[PDB]
Amino acid sequence: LNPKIIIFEQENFQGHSHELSGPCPNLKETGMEKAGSVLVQAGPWVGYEQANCKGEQFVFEKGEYPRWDSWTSSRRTDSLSSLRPIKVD
Amino acid sequence: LNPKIIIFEQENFQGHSHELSGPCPNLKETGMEKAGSVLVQAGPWVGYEQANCKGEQFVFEKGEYPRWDSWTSSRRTDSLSSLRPIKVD
């Protein structure tokens, strides 16, 4: 329907924000320096460690993710370089 | 509404199968020795490397995943220990 996702550069939803409503192969194009926290208004979305949907995957469901360890439990990285709405059904 | 996913003991949908329609914290409880391939009838789902939905995530959407390199575009590991439907809306 209307997928809406917002990335804040610092944890706890602080700093500059970047909104998406569709796929983004390279988050750097939004000016995002780094992913600090995520707000999902409408999802679900799948984020990727690297650009163009590569590397570790992370699921973003409607709700809040105030810190990197809120969206990953693999303990690998807080890197988030690409995002896309997840195909429903 | 009605999630449905099937895990095959081997790739190309060969060998024993194990059907799920809801969260499963430990795939070995279905008798699955290994996740050779995956078939998603109604998704999306998210699989985890470790039990109890912990560790690296892998998104499975409606469609077919014939081999261990169809969901984890990296030969990091083949282990799949838990799965759950992804929350919609």
Swiss-Prot record, chains A, B:
An annotated GO BP: visual perception
GO molecular function annotation: identical protein binding; structural constituent of eye lens
Residue span, Beta/gamma crystallin 'Greek key' domain: 3-42, 43-87
Coiled-coil intervals: none
Domain of life: Eukaryota
UniProt entry tagged with the keyword Transmembrane: no
Keywords: Acetylation, Eye lens protein, Repeat
Function of the molecule: Crystallins are the dominant structural components of the vertebrate eye lens.
Quaternary assembly: Homo/heterodimer, or complexes of higher-order. The structure of beta-crystallin oligomers seems to be stabilized through interactions between the N-terminal arms.
Protein family (similarity comment): Belongs to the beta/gamma-crystallin family.
Domains (record comment): Has a two-domain beta-structure, folded into four very similar Greek key motifs.
Name by which UniProt lists this protein: Beta-crystallin B2
